[PDB]
Ligand binder design. Structure first.
Ligand SMILES: O=P(O)(O)O[C@H]1[C@H](OP(=O)(O)O)[C@@H](OP(=O)(O)O)[C@H](OP(=O)(O)O)[C@@H](OP(=O)(O)O)[C@H]1OP(=O)(O)O
Lengths: 227, 134, 237, 215, 527, 212, 212
């Protein structure tokens, strides 16, 4: 509420007497500013939901992208504005394509997340790499510190913890992809409180069979027909 | 003498500075007079401040006051205020109380004149003619 | 921050350059150079405080070339560094230009280097004093001294260190009275001056004398028997 | 910048330098007092040649001065490599004041605490110039520098005239130093340089002594 | 020593300080000499105090000073003052404040002799006019030649002298103003009610006749001449004064419409200059010229110029001015609209003391002028007509200038010009209804009744102005103690009607934020 | 400090600067100059002392000469101003410039750049000392679209009469440059002492006539 | 960023809409001074041959953005042989930093096939595509005007697009005519910056539809 600062915070490269870099600490807990974004890893593929928050009906909804295609088997949902993420996204795309050029194979979701996290070493973008490789479908959260971790449901953004506490409860290992998509929409509608339609949420899935696929407006509204 | 002579209705404000600075200096140590020795009127101070704080011709450039005037007359009236007649509050409240419309700039005039003029150091034998009247 | 780095004060002063002369006085030691008709000597004191120290390694007299010597006064590591830079510039003058460096040109070069310390703010002035002696081929004996400000001058005699001002007063009363010259007197003048302002009546293990002469321009560091041969000749008069 | 005004404070604390532009030449006299008799006055020089036709003098800080003496002489000879013609005095002052301005723009350095009086002779025509530590340069008829330069600049403004010869300009440049000398100048404690058609040269102390005897 | 206090040291110094411009040992080429005359003229204007011309000690100060020279606790035994030299004291003082007058009128004349002296640089005449601008007295009117000077260089080719002349001639028209007579009304003699005790503020029955009611504006010369017209906007809100001034009727006021032979011979100079077309075309050419692009304002210094013009002469100058300001509202320029807003403001404020026929003729002129001027309002222009109209009806009776409000509350939210002129005509009107506080209850009700159908129907830059206007509509409903409930719009009564309209947003099931029935218009209302 | 005028006409442009000396012995051989030719067909004036004036002026000359090296044509006048204003945008030189030129696309031109990297085309303007006084005196009396170099020189000396501080307008104190087109060639003519004398005496004859 | 975004709101209103076979882009041309030449103030700058741009904000910062995008249109055309997409050069302009510059930009034009595009860059680099938009002073109210009047039947012919742009500027630009600056494209052709006579004709047909 009031004001609680010390002499050891906001020094840019300076440890505290408890070994802490509080300039970096507060610059990681200022990337909660982004809109909410839920990835859920299932055995049938990974799903990625993010809220879109369109300003005007004169604006194309397909022009602000909060889920991008990294490669045909990897999508990524960011929280925060796109212009902060876009060097990390371009780095991820270039790394998948250099891995293809040298190795003639698809790069794993962990290795893409590691190659982005190397470039993140802050940079102030939380990302959610969801994808399918030879280890099955895999979801990777990478916080703005550069720390990445496999996670089988994860919410990043404005209400990350309130949605994460719901993802702790709906998720189980035997969850189908349609149940994951319905659950991610329920939790997005909960942390949003708005009516849920195909102009304020994006959704994309990466399945083991097909490629990275963004839902179109007709395919998206079939999902919210029974939410 | 230097009160009746500092308040002359068309006196030169430039040399009124010296008469006022002496007159502050003669009423500065308040415990030396007792309201049984001195009963300075308040009206020639009010006609003095109207001429010099709410002048009608200074903004047109016809008067050109000294710059340290407002600060030396607001203490000149502050100096003479513990010696005003007992009836002064009741006749400062029939003359500035008409100006108390809170929607224009003349409420400002009322409360500046109350903050300068309106007497607060009277004996308790006549609080009923002082602050318990406003 | 106007008194922390080498930038101008509001009255136009460089305070770090002023504090480097305070740093020269930190060493506790006073050096004296005087100049004769055909000779130029340098005498400093050789206070060895630790008695299990190798006293042959404590020296402020340095050979720069065979013909140029040097007494240093001030912060000792700064002194060794400025000596290494003077030895470099002497050898590089000889290489590029084909003749031995003059004493004024070497002292001018070291002062030109010291100005850079007084002007860039990221390094400090190098808090010590160099006095160079050597025999010029056309001008005779030369005594040159460069300070941490980047000034240098030629000196009939000079002094550097703690008792510099009183040594200067002594030598200034001395050189307007006589034209001090000859090999013996000029060591006498530089031993008496150090002795008078330190007031300690030297034994030869306590000072050290470096000479150049016109008859042999090699910079010599005096043997302790030779400082005896001057101190006995001075101590009975 | 504030360091430029503080660098001008170190100039006005320096020794007086006076330079007068005569009809057939330019003088540059300075104040050169030795702090004691121990200092060889023959050794270090304040009036200093840059070319065979340009010399200069300063007030302020001598070690800062030698840095621009060295770089004026480099700019002059790299002009002479290109054109095989002696550099114009005004061109050289533009080059040197550009150098002297560089140390005010860059951080982590201070300005020079030195102000130059550049004299010259090119195309049969003398030049008097002053470069300030800011990097600004002014052409002069006559000016003073250093300690009480204001009083010198109004002493000069009274005794300056345009149909003035070089010898008379030496006479009234010694007088401008003598108005602030504090204690009986001699040929060993001032230093004069002249430009004329024969080029720049610094007067020998035997030649300064006769000018002082004429006063 | 240049601004010492006596006359005998200013009459010497100021003509020397202006006449030192043609001195031939003087050089403004030196940058220190320009800095010092700017310091000299800058210091005097900063430290001049008005001087003298009258020192007469009354018969109260000399009464209490005789007792101080006869007190006998401590004294030197000094003689009683002879009435022979209580006559030489008046003798020396009456001729001491007589050459104060001589030195003042000498100083003005020799500043005028110096400021036009056959070859003098423009710095020294700009100095000698500002020093002359320090001498606008208020004890006397200014010297006839200086009236001539400051009037003839309203149109001077230097803009600095023009602004000095605008200030000086506004001071001249204040010096030259004829005093308007006042009577005393009992305020329960026009209202007809007991004017109760236990002092209560706000809208009362003895206060009510002073409110703007649309059924009681005069509209004829007879209902105008028999009417009260309390001018100030605060009299009678809290309480009435001991005596209260009225501005009595035209039969006892100073007569207006004089034919230049009746004028006071310094009104002659202003009349003979402000009534011919050539002076006025040069004046309005210089005075419609841009000075500082993007930084120019309404400039109440130039408003005080034209308020005094239409306060002393009032009738003959606008036939000279009507082509010039008829041309001037049609220009889509910025500074031409600045110029006519100052003239219209001073012409409305100047018509405070006119006859009904003369204000009737004024408003037959000004109504199409203001209609064109508010239709042609611009982003470069809107906060200048907002200052024109708020200036033109400050400290005025709302019934007297009711033509403003009928022009300007007719359709502020109309649609030609689109948005931003709906917002700015509703802003120009805002300052007009803001200056006439508590005293125009209806017409604020008319604006609320006009503009409650339009909270939904309007764009982003206008409902900001709607919000500021509703703030100035509900300023008068105060919970101030012992204040009678106003005739002005009540803020609880309005927001209950809002709460009716905004009911379908705050119900159950919580779905909101669509902004794409009685729900989306509720969102538009809530904006 | 310093000030200069710039006035566009139909048959040319002018710059009209000050030559005021701050001290009695500043020589003026060096300070006499105030107009700076930049190429064959373009000139400028600065607001500042001669040292940073030359720092701007040689960079302008160098940009004009590398344009001439690439295209063998003189640089168009707005384009040299654009080049230096893009140099002064990257440095955010507290000096304003006033350009006169002629190019084949746009004719006679008059530009004014500020320190912040902006510039503007003007028909008459002033930079430096009493700038606002001179443009307020100039906005009155500059007739747009119908002035010639005779009326432009008359305006130049009329504005400099009551905005220069020099207390007696003489030909020693003003540099006037005149940029005209003469049979296919741009002539930047620094207008000399006898003609400035003749134009000041013709101005004074007009003011002394209107005084009668 | 927030400093750079408050630099935009002070700047002039720029309106862009995208049609079927036309993209129109109109800016409030503003009275600059009296002796100012209004040619040098552009505010509408062509980028490649098929990509135009209006900005709002600082004109010194805009000119360098215009220059860098205008070079990269040719560099893209020299490495990839085809013209830039409006997406491409929009993404390049939003990627430019200096600070960020301090402009917002409406970028209209056509891609190679013939699709109209409208894009809008922010000083934080976060561009997105539009069907109609306004930037600059009074931009939110003009955008509120355009969520009412951008319909399919209001942009279906080529002239009603231009008149939609004019009616959008005529909200906040109260001069009614001469003080707005238009530019259309009409795919495969060029910019066609509209004359003051053609703008006045279109304003006349807009005014004639207002007594009805
Ligand atoms: O008409 P306004 O703009 O409200 O100005 C009036 C007016 O002064 P001017 O005529 O000089 O502008 C009054 O003068 P009369 O018309 O009554 O002759 C004057 O009254 P006094 O002359 O009696 O001072 C009054 O001043 P005040 O309100 O102090 O009575 C003053 O109003 P402002 O003070 O608002 O200018």
């Amino acid at each position: 509420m009031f004001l609680t600062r010390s002499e050891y915070d906001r020094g840019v490269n300076t440890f505290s007497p408890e070994g802490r870099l509080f300039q970096v600490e507060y610059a990681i807990e200022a990337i909660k500013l982004g809109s909410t974004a839920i990835g859920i890893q299932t055995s049938e593929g990974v799903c990625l939901a993010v809220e879109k928050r369109i300003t005007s009906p004169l604006m194309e909804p397909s022009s602000i992208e909060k889920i991008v295609e990294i490669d045909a088997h990897i999508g990524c949902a960011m929280s925060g504005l796109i212009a902060d993420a876009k060097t990390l996204i371009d780095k991820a795309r270039v790394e998948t394509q250099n891995h293809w050029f040298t190795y003639n194979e698809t790069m794993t979701v962990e290795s893409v997340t590691q190659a982005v996290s190397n470039l993140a070493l802050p940079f102030g973008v939380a990302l959610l790499f969801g994808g399918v490789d030879e280890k099955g479908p895999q979801l990777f959260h990478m916080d703005p510190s550069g720390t990445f971790v496999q996670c089988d449901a994860r919410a990043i953004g404005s209400a990350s913890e309130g949605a994460q506490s719901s993802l702790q409860e709906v998720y189980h290992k035997s969850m189908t992809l349609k149940e994951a998509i319905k659950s991610s929409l329920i939790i997005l509608k909960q942390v949003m409180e708005e009516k849920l339609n195909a102009t304020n949420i994006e959704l994309a899935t990466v399945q083991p069979g097909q490629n990275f696929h963004m839902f179109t407006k007709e395919e998206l509204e079939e999902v919210i027909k029974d939410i | 003498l230097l009160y009746e002579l500092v308040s002359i209705p068309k006196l030169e404000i430039s040399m009124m500075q010296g008469f006022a600075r002496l007159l502050i200096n003669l009423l500065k140590k308040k415990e030396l007079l007792s309201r049984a020795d001195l009963e300075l009127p308040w009206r020639p101070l009010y006609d003095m401040v109207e001429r010099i704080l709410y002048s009608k011709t200074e903004h047109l450039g016809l008067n050109w006051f000294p710059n340290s005037v407002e600060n030396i007359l607001k203490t000149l009236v502050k100096s003479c205020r513990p010696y005003f007649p007992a009836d002064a509050t009741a006749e400062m409240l029939e003359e500035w109380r008409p100006l108390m419309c809170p929607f224009d700039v003349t409420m400002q005039k009322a409360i500046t004149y109350f903050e300068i003029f309106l007497p607060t150091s009277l004996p308790p034998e006549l609080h009923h003619k002082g602050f318990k009247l406003w | 921050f106007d008194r922390h780095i080498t930038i101008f004060s509001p009255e136009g002063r460089l305070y770090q350059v002023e504090y480097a002369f305070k740093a020269i006085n930190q060493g506790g030691l006073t050096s004296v150079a005087v100049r004769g008709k055909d000779c130029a000597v340098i005498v400093t004191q050789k206070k060895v405080p630790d008695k299990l120290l190798d006293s042959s390694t404590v020296t402020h007299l340095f050979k720069i070339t065979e013909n140029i010597g040097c007494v240093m006064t001030g912060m000792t590591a700064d002194s060794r560094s400025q000596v290494q830079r003077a030895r470099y510039e002497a050898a590089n003058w000889k290489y590029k230009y084909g003749y031995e460096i003059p004493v004024d040109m070497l002292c001018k070069r070291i002062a030109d280097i010291s100005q850079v310390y007084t002007q860039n703010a990221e390094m400090r002035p190098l808090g010590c004093c160099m006095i160079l002696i050597g025999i010029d081929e056309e001008q005779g004996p030369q005594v040159y001294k460069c300070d941490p400000a980047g000034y240098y001058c030629g000196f009939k005699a000079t002094a550097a260190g703690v008792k510099q001002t009183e040594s200067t007063s002594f030598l200034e009363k001395k050189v307007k009275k006589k034209f001090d010259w000859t090999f013996e007197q000029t060591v006498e003048t530089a031993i008496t001056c150090l002795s008078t302002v330190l007031s300690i009546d030297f034994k030869p293990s306590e000072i050290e004398v470096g000479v150049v002469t016109v008859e042999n321009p090699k910079f010599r560091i005096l043997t302790e028997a030779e400082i005896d041969a001057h101190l006995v000749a001075l101590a009975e008069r | 910048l504030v360091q430029i005004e503080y660098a001008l404070a170190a100039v006005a604390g320096g020794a007086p330098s006076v330079g007068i532009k005569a009809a057939n030449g330019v003088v540059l006299a300075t104040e050169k007092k030795q702090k004691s008799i121990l200092y060889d006055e023959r050794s270090v020089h304040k009036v200093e040649p840059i070319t065979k036709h340009i010399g200069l003098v300063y007030s302020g800080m001598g070690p800062d001065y030698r840095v621009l003496v060295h770089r004026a002489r480099k700019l002059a000879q790299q002009y002479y490599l290109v054109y095989q013609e002696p550099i114009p005095t005004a061109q050289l002052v533009q080059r040197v004041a550009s150098v002297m301005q560089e140390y005010t723009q860059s951080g982590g350095v201070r300005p020079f605490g030195v102000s130059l009086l550049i004299c010259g002779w090119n195309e049969g025509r003398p030049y008097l110039f002053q470069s300030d530590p800011s990097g600004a340069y002014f052409a002069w008829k006559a000016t003073a520098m250093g300690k009480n330069y204001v009083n010198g600049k109004t002493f000069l403004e009274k005794r300056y005239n345009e149909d003035l010869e070089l010898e008379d300009a030496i006479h009234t440049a010694i007088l401008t130093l003598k108005e602030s000398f504090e204690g009986q100048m001699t040929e060993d404690n001032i230093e004069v340089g002249i430009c004329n058609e024969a080029g720049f040269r610094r007067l020998t102390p035997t030649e300064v002594k006769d000018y002082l005897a004429a006063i | 020593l240049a601004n010492l206090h006596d006359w005998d040291c200013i009459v010497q110094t100021w003509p020397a300080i202006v006449s030192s411009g043609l001195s031939q040992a003087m050089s403004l080429e030196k940058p220190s000499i320009v800095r010092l005359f700017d310091d000299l003229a800058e210091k005097i204007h900063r430290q001049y105090e008005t001087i003298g011309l009258d020192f007469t000690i009354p018969k109260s100060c000399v009464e209490i000073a005789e007792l101080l020279q006869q007190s006998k606790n401590p004294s030197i035994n000094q003689i009683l003052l002879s009435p022979e030299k209580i006559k030489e004291g008046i003798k020396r003082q009456q001729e001491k404040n007589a050459d104060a007058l001589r030195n003042y009128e000498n100083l003005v004349d020799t500043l005028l002799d110096g400021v036009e002296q056959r070859n003098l640089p423009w710095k020294f005449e700009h100095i000698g006019i500002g020093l002359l601008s320090l001498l606008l007295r208020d004890d006397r009117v200014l010297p006839l030649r200086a009236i001539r000077f400051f009037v003839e260089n309203l149109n001077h080719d230097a803009i600095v002298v023009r602004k000095m002349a605008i200030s000086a001639v506004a001071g001249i028209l204040k010096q030259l103003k004829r005093t308007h007579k006042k009577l005393t009304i009992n305020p329960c003699e026009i209202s007809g009610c007991p004017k109760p005790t236990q002092i209560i503020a706000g809208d009362r029955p003895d206060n009510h006749w002073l409110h703007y009611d649309s059924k009681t504006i005069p509209r004829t010369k007879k209902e105008w001449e028999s009417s009260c017209f309390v001018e100030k906007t605060h009299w009678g809100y809290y309480t009435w004064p001991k005596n209260m001034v009225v501005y009595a009727g035209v039969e006892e006021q100073p007569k207006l419409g004089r034919s230049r032979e009746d004028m006071t011979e310094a009104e002659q100079i202003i009349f003979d200059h402000f009534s011919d077309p050539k002076f006025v075309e040069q004046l309005i050419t210089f005075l419609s010229l841009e000075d500082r692009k993007g930084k120019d304002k309404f400039n109440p210094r130039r408003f005080c110029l034209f308020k005094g013009i239409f306060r002393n002469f009032d009738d003959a100058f606008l036939p000279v001015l009507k082509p010039h300001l008829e041309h001037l509202v049609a220009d889509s320029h910025e500074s031409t609209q600045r110029c006519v807003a100052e003239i219209i403001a001073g012409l409305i404020r100047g018509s405070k003391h006119w006859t009904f026929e003369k204000v009737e003729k004024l408003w037959e002129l000004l109504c199409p002028l203001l209609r064109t001027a508010l239709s042609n309002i611009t982003v470069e222009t809107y906060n200048d007509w907002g200052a024109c109209i708020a200036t033109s009806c400050e400290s005025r009776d709302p019934r007297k200038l009711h033509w403003l409000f009928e022009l300007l509350l007719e359709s502020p939210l109309s649609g030609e010009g689109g948005s931003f002129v709906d917002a700015c005509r509703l802003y120009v009107l805002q300052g007009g209804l803001a200056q006439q506080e508590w005293r125009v209850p209806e017409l604020l009700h008319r604006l609320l009744k006009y503009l409650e159908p339009k909270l939904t129907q309007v764009y982003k830059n206008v409902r900001e102005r709607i919000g500021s206007v509703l703030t100035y509509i509900f300023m008068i409903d105060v919970s101030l103690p012992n204040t009678t409930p106003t005739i002005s719009p009540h803020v609880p009564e309005f927001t209950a009607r809002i709460l009716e309209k905004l009911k379908p947003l705050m119900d159950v099931d919580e779905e909101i934020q669509n902004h794409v029935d009685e729900r989306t218009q509720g969102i538009k209302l809530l904006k | 400090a310093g000030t200069c005028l710039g006035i566009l006409a139909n048959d040319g442009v002018l710059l009209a600067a000050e030559r005021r000396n701050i001290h009695k012995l500043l020589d003026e051989v060096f300070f006499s100059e105030k107009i700076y030719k930049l190429n064959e067909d373009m000139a400028c004036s600065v607001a500042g002392i001669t040292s940073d004036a030359n720092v701007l002026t040689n960079e302008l000359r160098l940009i004009a000469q590398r344009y001439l090296l690439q295209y063998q044509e003189p640089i168009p006048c707005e384009q040299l101003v654009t080049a230096l204003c893009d140099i002064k945008q990257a440095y955010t030189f507290g000096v304003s410039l006033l350009y006169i030129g002629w190019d084949k696309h746009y004719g006679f031109q008059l530009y004014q750049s500020d320190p912040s990297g902006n510039y503007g085309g003007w028909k008459a303007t002033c930079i430096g000392n009493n700038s606002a006084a001179a443009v307020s005196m100039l906005k009155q009396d500059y007739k747009e679209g119908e002035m010639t170099l005779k009326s432009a020189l008359a305006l130049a000396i009329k504005v400099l009469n009551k905005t220069m501080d020099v207390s007696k307008l003489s030909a020693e104190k003003v540099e006037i440059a005149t940029l005209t087109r003469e049979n296919g060639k741009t002539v930047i003519r620094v207008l000399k002492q006898k003609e400035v004398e003749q134009l000041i005496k013709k101005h004074e004859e007009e003011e002394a006539k209107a005084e009668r | 960023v927030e400093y750079a975004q408050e630099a935009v709101k002070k700047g002039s209103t720029a309106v862009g809409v995208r049609g079927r076979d036309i993209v129109v882009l109109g800016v409030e041309k503003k009275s600059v001074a009296k002796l100012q030449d209004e040619r040098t103030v552009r505010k509408i700058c062509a980028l490649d041959d098929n990509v135009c741009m209006a900005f709002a904000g600082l004109t010194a910062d805009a000119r360098i953005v215009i220059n860098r995008a205008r070079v990269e249109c040719q560099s893209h055309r020299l490495t990839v042989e085809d013209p830039v997409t409006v997406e491409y050069i929009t993404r390049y302009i939003a990627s430019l930093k200096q600070r960020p510059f301090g402009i917002s930009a409406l970028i209209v034009g056509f891609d190679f096939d013939g699709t109209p595009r409208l894009y809008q860059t922010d000083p934080s680099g976060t561009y997105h595509a539009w069907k109609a938009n306004a930037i600059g002073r009074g931009a939110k109210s003009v955008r509120e005007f355009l969520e009412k009047n951008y319909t399919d039947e209001a942009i279906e012919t080529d002239d009603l697009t231009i008149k939609l742009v004019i009616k959008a500027l005529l909200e906040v630009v109260q001069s009614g005519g001469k003080n707005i600056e238009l530019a259309v494209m009409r795919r495969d052709q060029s910019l066609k910056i509209l004359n003051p006579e053609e703008i006045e004709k279109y304003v006349a047909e807009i005014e004639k539809e207002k007594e009805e």
